[PDB]
Amino acid sequence: EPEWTYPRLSCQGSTFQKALLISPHRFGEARGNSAPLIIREPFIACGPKECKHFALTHYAAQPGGYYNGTREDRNKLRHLISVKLGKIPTVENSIFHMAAWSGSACHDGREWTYIGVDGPDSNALIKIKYGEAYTDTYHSYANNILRTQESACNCIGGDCYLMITDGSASGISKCRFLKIREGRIIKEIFPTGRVEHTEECTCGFASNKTIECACRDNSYTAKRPFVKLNVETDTAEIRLMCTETYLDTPRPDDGSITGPCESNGDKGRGGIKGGFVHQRMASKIGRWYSRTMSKTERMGMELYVRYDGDPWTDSDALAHSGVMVSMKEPGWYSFGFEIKDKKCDVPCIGIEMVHDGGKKTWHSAATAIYCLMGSGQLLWDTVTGVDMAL
Amino acid sequence: EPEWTYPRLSCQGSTFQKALLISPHRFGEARGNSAPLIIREPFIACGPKECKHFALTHYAAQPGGYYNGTREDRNKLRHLISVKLGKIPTVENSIFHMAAWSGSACHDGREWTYIGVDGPDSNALIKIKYGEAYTDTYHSYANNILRTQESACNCIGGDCYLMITDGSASGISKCRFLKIREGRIIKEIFPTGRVEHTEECTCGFASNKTIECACRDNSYTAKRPFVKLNVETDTAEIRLMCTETYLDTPRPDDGSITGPCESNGDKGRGGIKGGFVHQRMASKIGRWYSRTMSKTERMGMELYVRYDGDPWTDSDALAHSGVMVSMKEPGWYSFGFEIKDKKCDVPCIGIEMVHDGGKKTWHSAATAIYCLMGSGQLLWDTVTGVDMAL
Amino acid sequence: EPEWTYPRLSCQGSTFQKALLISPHRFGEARGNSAPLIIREPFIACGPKECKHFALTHYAAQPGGYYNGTREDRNKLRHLISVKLGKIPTVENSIFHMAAWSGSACHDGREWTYIGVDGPDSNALIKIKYGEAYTDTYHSYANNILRTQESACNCIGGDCYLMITDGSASGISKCRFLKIREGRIIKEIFPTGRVEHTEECTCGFASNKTIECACRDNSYTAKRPFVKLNVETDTAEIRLMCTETYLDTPRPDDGSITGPCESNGDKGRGGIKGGFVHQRMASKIGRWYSRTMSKTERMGMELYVRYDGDPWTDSDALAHSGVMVSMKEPGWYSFGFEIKDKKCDVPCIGIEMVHDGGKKTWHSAATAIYCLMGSGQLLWDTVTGVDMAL
Amino acid sequence: EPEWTYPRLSCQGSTFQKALLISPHRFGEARGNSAPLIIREPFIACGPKECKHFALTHYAAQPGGYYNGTREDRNKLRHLISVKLGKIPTVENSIFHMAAWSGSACHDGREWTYIGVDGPDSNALIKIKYGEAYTDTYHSYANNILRTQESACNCIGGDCYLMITDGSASGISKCRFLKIREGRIIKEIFPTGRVEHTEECTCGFASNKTIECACRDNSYTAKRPFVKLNVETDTAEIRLMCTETYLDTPRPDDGSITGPCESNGDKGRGGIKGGFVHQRMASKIGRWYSRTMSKTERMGMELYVRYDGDPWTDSDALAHSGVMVSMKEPGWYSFGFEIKDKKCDVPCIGIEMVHDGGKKTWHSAATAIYCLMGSGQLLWDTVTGVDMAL
Numbered sequence A, B, C, D: 001e002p003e004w005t006y007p008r009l010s011c012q013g014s015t016f017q018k019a020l021l022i023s024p025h026r027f028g029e030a031r032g033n034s035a036p037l038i039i040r041e042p043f044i045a046c047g048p049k050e051c052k053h054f055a056l057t058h059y060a061a062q063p064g065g066y067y068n069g070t071r072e073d074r075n076k077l078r079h080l081i082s083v084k085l086g087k088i089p090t091v092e093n094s095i096f097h098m099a100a101w102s103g104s105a106c107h108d109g110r111e112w113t114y115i116g117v118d119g120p121d122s123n124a125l126i127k128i129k130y131g132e133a134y135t136d137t138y139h140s141y142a143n144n145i146l147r148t149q150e151s152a153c154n155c156i157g158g159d160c161y162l163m164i165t166d167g168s169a170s171g172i173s174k175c176r177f178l179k180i181r182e183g184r185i186i187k188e189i190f191p192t193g194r195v196e197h198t199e200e201c202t203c204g205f206a207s208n209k210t211i212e213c214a215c216r217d218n219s220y221t222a223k224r225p226f227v228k229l230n231v232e233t234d235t236a237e238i239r240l241m242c243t244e245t246y247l248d249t250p251r252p253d254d255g256s257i258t259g260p261c262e263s264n265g266d267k268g269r270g271g272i273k274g275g276f277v278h279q280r281m282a283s284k285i286g287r288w289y290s291r292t293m294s295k296t297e298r299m300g301m302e303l304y305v306r307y308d309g310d311p312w313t314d315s316d317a318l319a320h321s322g323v324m325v326s327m328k329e330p331g332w333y334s335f336g337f338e339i340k341d342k343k344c345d346v347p348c349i350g351i352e353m354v355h356d357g358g359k360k361t362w363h364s365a366a367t368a369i370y371c372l373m374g375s376g377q378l379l380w381d382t383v384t385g386v387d388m389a390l
């Protein structure tokens, strides 16, 4: 049948470039004739021949009459939807996979695994679908909003890994990893180290032996929790990123958190899911990350890279690698993903660009894509082009 | 060629969970740009690779100008349509299979069989289509609205079985079963037993030897007629389910119908098609059923199960297994179906949630899907989210 | 590669039944959200796995602003379009094949041949496309509106046959047949017999050796010109249908044309393209035909059949086989076609049901389908359901 | 795998004929329900099985609220999009390939290569995508709007050749050719000859050894720069076409540029991209070209041909071969392309017909297609049918 998929060396390249903007609300004007779906938390995952652009819809279109409530996180109507990357996610072009107010998905070489969380806050549920068939669930172990990545899970040899957490977004959230094979949970991994508060991990393969993730601590630090997961022993350890280039929002100024790598620092409450993707070379490993340009609001988005070293011990500043979204434009969640070329994998970061006018209007987002492409430096930024009054 | 489909053991699991809501009219606002089809009597049937969501449209969309007449059951415009499950059934997303005001469909491992009934009330006609070709018909035997399941037929080794009936909805309607192979009726099956009124059977496989069905009696009882059909002898027998948990609507209080299992009891006139699906295990069979929360109106929907026993003689209560639709929301027809996972079958029940504002406005429905998924207990209910005024 | 296609014996059956209605303007209301294409001259042709529903669009949608001019026959904007049968022919669901104000198409087993005529009236052009590639043309031989079938051409062993004509619709139109193989004209057949005025032939296989067509004489008779074409010698002869059941509109009363079979009779000026399809049995040949119910206007449509005999010598009345469209509904062009079942061919007649409100509004049509299905008699008629004011 | 595509001998034929009009804005009325994309610079490229219709959208639809800015050439929103040729390029029918305000694309027998340029004017960037993956980039060499063909690139044995240029549109712009294999630049080709200004080359294969291109000089002449590129040595040479039939717009009267073949002549500033395609025969080569009917404005389009000779030294007039667009209708860019029939290639020219109502309204285009088809002479012209006020 199809071979199972594995991480491969990345395609040659040394800079990212602007690739593609999916801005559905460019066609949502009241005088227009389209039906872009109102969504948030977009992410992309690719199989061998195609990528799918996922998001959590509020099950409402622009223009329409169900804008009230579209700025809330969880309810009984939100669903995980997708379109093939490059198609506009409208009512008709999308597929509704399952009810979900938190999601993930990934292809293993043979088939797609879709993950969607719903249920009441005190007792929510991870539901897993493999292709068409609902195949498994996982229960709330801390009875406070069981939730997951909002980005691609990661499969190697048929084993797909997924970060989940449950418990307080303001206190302790001890996260866990699930190992899922053909839609069924075959192992639960309890991490070690700094496990007190890890949210919305963005994960990817550092090699065939290691998954790494850069996550969000919503209460104590603007340094990102960083996961190293050994795929062969099914063990994970988490410690803060030591770089003075703190990747969360809010954050203090770079280099301002004194003391050892584990020091929490100021402006730690609050957070944002951040992009991270690997460039695997025969010789070395590139780790690419994104963060907003404002230190306090979800505005702008800049790319950074560092080759090798240990993210847990290295306080060195990451190398600035281009403005993907200026300060004038929204820069909300970002995520890594990889496109499969014939012989190598292309690392990319996607950027959620939320159209926020508060609760008295519709709330949704565009998705911008940057990928490793040629040499030199990143050349152009992305704007959504949407006027929320139309 | 591909080979013929057979029932397999069900996938492991012990509770149903909310899976998917297809709520087309969330996009039918006058100020929106979508064209959801006005439908009723939805059902789902799946082949090895995909499930189709079928319904009987009134050949009208919302917003639109043909709302008058969409509350009627039968006319020259109704058609059997489908979309791939997960797509919104809109004017352009749907395929129109055949003219029909009663329908069924099922896949035999190789091709789809579509069933549509139309024709004058006194001389209506079952029409069968195999793939793209119209292959056979069956004539009215009692000249009083020949009609069929409104849920999936059931194929084993190329033979597809279908319930049909003809007769007064407030008098005698003696059903029959058709055995259909590659779109052609190869055998008529005349049931034995309590045969005076059987409607809208929801049928599935209890094993490779037995199809069972939970049906509606619209005239005499609130207990469901229960068919056991032996596929090897092509014989069927019907008796009333003896459980005190009467699955019809209207119904009297549970356990209030005194006397032997076959006693009709009180609040017998009227009815609703009911969900039923099997959970086949190596040595145990789970029978899952749904019924409205109101005893008299089509409001809410609750799940019930019983393992083993004989439905014809067990008076014990069915075990309540979750509120799928609250008393506040519409609960009209329900039906069972199975999704084909790689090595096993996933039992599910779908729920038609009709938007009824009377004869004065459009009339149509959302479809809610619940499936056997994991263990523990059912966690959340389904709302359509539709404001019929928009 | 794919085998070339041949006519096969028809599937068992002895009556037609209502199969499917494609009524796109059921969704064309000004307050709705759809874009049905404004069309006329629909026809259907099938390959081994799918049928396509063709028509000549005016390149305009309802609702829209280009209604003026949609009641004219030829212009620089009309195009041959199609959708898979069962899909609604809207702006987006359709494929535009080529510029054309007269058309035909057919599948040969391996690929589709599309035929579209355009150009100025005095010097028009048959253009032939095989799949994606424009492959050949044929010139106007009489410089008066070169034109073709408005129904499926017919392929056997890779050879596809097509009737064309050129010359006066009120005087002499000597028609011709083209033999097209892989999109290229490989023979021109000059018919013999009554060749003075043959229009819009509806053709099909009587056997592997003979194509037959029932055509329209627009100036001299209400009897249909009937073509017998020997596929092996590539010769054709044409003579009038002798049946007293005159199939054209206008027409006099049945049996009223006195004298031999060739006698022209009264009310011969004017005409309509008529449905005709074969039921090939091992033993005998069924010839099915349709005609309007009004003897003078394009209202209603009735089915007729006769087995065996020679259409050129037999004055016997055809057997009335059901009202497909009542007198209250439009009955304009009709055409035969065949759907391919696994082992046999299903004969069908399609009916163009024009929405005509004159030139001050839009002009388009619905398509109704009837096919051979089971035994007994035809049970129900078709209405478009469209109110042209909406 | 499939194998690499090579030029083949053209299909038999001696005249072009009107083939297809894709006029999206026939459905863009304010009272309509469609969403045609606002585009410019359309072109078509075909693989073995299908042709794609590409254009540069302004990421806006008609009707809509983003018309301001749609007359500009370059901005952060323009994207390269396509549909299968024959589909209307609407918001939902199109795929968005990459951010781009100059584009090209072509199929090599195995996969599609997409080319998109964006970035700041002084430092723009060629981006290449092979299938779904971004594979390589090329940087600005003259820091003045690096840009490319706006028509199909050309592949032979897996090597795809592309013209690019960079420099002042009213001064020096020395083009270059990129040799691209599986999405990666494997060679730069620096032309020899009259190299001071070459833009928007329309290129194709004269044989297995030679690509030829008819280009635009926007600064010095109304004669088209003509590239002969030797694919075996990967060398190119450019000289002005010597024909008195000057193919650019503006242009002086035919034959009025006196002196030797390389003389620039009068009315040289300004220009338009021009159609050119080859008709390869066993011993003769036809070179087909198009130019506007007006000498000074983008109004009308006429076809011309010349067999054999050397474009660089023949001053003889090109033979006029039909009016494709009358003086009354828009004739803006034209381009050549070839459709792959079963054993031979069909040469065609497409014509962008821009709807220009100035900066005050939307700005976009229809695409007209003419192809070598049969013999005799070209018979009809193309109108867009669009009233820009609706």
Ligand SMILES: CCCN(CCc1ccccc1)C(=O)[C@@H]1OC(C(=O)O)=C[C@H](N)[C@H]1NC(C)=O
Binding pocket: A041, A073, A074, A101, A102, A144, A145, A147, A167, A168, A169, A170, A199, A200, A218, A271, A272
């Ligand atoms: C911190 C990341 C996840 N949390 C915290 C959930 C939580 C709240 C209170 C107590 C416990 C848990 C968020 O809120 C996420 O934030 C955001 C956000 O933009 O900050 C978007 C997500 N839609 C939301 N996720 C869920 C599942 O609601």
Ligand SMILES: CCCN(CCc1ccccc1)C(=O)[C@@H]1OC(C(=O)O)=C[C@H](N)[C@H]1NC(C)=O
Binding pocket: B041, B073, B074, B101, B102, B144, B145, B147, B167, B168, B169, B170, B199, B200, B216, B218, B271, B272
């Ligand atoms: C009882 C279930 C089937 N019947 C009885 C039909 C009948 C009426 C009167 C005399 C004889 C027969 C219904 O009315 C069904 O009810 C309902 C319903 O919601 O109860 C929906 C179906 N659209 C309708 N089916 C048909 C075929 O009309």
Ligand SMILES: CCCN(CCc1ccccc1)C(=O)[C@@H]1OC(C(=O)O)=C[C@H](N)[C@H]1NC(C)=O
Binding pocket: C041, C073, C074, C101, C102, C144, C145, C147, C167, C168, C169, C170, C199, C200, C218, C271, C272
């Ligand atoms: C008689 C059938 C074909 N003709 C005659 C064409 C003609 C007119 C005058 C002189 C010569 C030829 C028709 O008009 C057809 O009639 C009709 C019709 O509904 O009667 C529809 C067709 N759109 C039209 N065909 C063309 C190609 O215009």
Ligand SMILES: CCCN(CCc1ccccc1)C(=O)[C@@H]1OC(C(=O)O)=C[C@H](N)[C@H]1NC(C)=O
Binding pocket: D041, D073, D074, D101, D102, D144, D145, D147, D167, D168, D169, D170, D199, D200, D216, D218, D271, D272
């Ligand atoms: C001359 C053809 C390319 N140029 C020159 C670009 C340029 C301007 C000024 C200085 C340097 C370069 C054009 O302006 C093209 O013109 C036209 C046009 O209609 O003439 C359409 C193209 N959208 C545009 N291309 C770009 C890439 O902007």
Ligand SMILES: *[C@@H]1O[C@H](CO)[C@@H](O)[C@H](O)[C@H]1NC(C)=O
Binding pocket: A006, A007, A008, A009, A207, A208, A280
């Ligand atoms: C990972 O392992 C697979 C399977 O053995 C191999 O094909 C692939 O190229 C490896 N990836 C690396 C070395 O990054």
Ligand SMILES: *[C@@H]1O[C@H](CO)[C@@H](O)[C@H](O)[C@H]1NC(C)=O
Binding pocket: B006, B007, B008, B009, B207, B208, B280
């Ligand atoms: C039914 O029989 C088939 C073989 O005909 C077998 O493959 C399948 O697993 C059986 N299923 C059950 C439920 O017994």
Ligand SMILES: *[C@@H]1O[C@H](CO)[C@@H](O)[C@H](O)[C@H]1NC(C)=O
Binding pocket: C006, C007, C008, C009, C207, C208, C280
């Ligand atoms: C026609 O000929 C083909 C090929 O020989 C055959 O397969 C087919 O069944 C024949 N059709 C008839 C007998 O009608």
Ligand SMILES: *[C@@H]1O[C@H](CO)[C@@H](O)[C@H](O)[C@H]1NC(C)=O
Binding pocket: D006, D007, D008, D009, D207, D208, D280
């Ligand atoms: C070009 O060469 C290929 C083989 O490489 C051949 O198949 C093809 O017909 C040739 N075409 C021309 C136009 O010479």
Ligand SMILES: [Ca+2]
Binding pocket: A216, A217, A218, A219, A220, A221, A222, A223, A248, A249, A250, A267, A268, A269, A270, A271, A272
């Ligand atoms: Ca934080």
Ligand SMILES: [Ca+2]
Binding pocket: A034, A035, A091, A092, B033, B034, B035
């Ligand atoms: Ca829509």
Ligand SMILES: [Ca+2]
Binding pocket: B216, B217, B218, B219, B220, B221, B222, B223, B248, B249, B250, B267, B268, B269, B270, B271
């Ligand atoms: Ca009852």
Ligand SMILES: [Ca+2]
Binding pocket: C216, C217, C218, C219, C220, C221, C222, C223, C248, C249, C250, C267, C268, C269, C270, C271, C272
């Ligand atoms: Ca006549």
Ligand SMILES: [Ca+2]
Binding pocket: C034, C035, C091, C092, D033, D034, D035
């Ligand atoms: Ca549309």
Ligand SMILES: [Ca+2]
Binding pocket: D216, D217, D218, D219, D220, D221, D222, D223, D248, D249, D250, D267, D268, D269, D270, D271
């Ligand atoms: Ca010039």
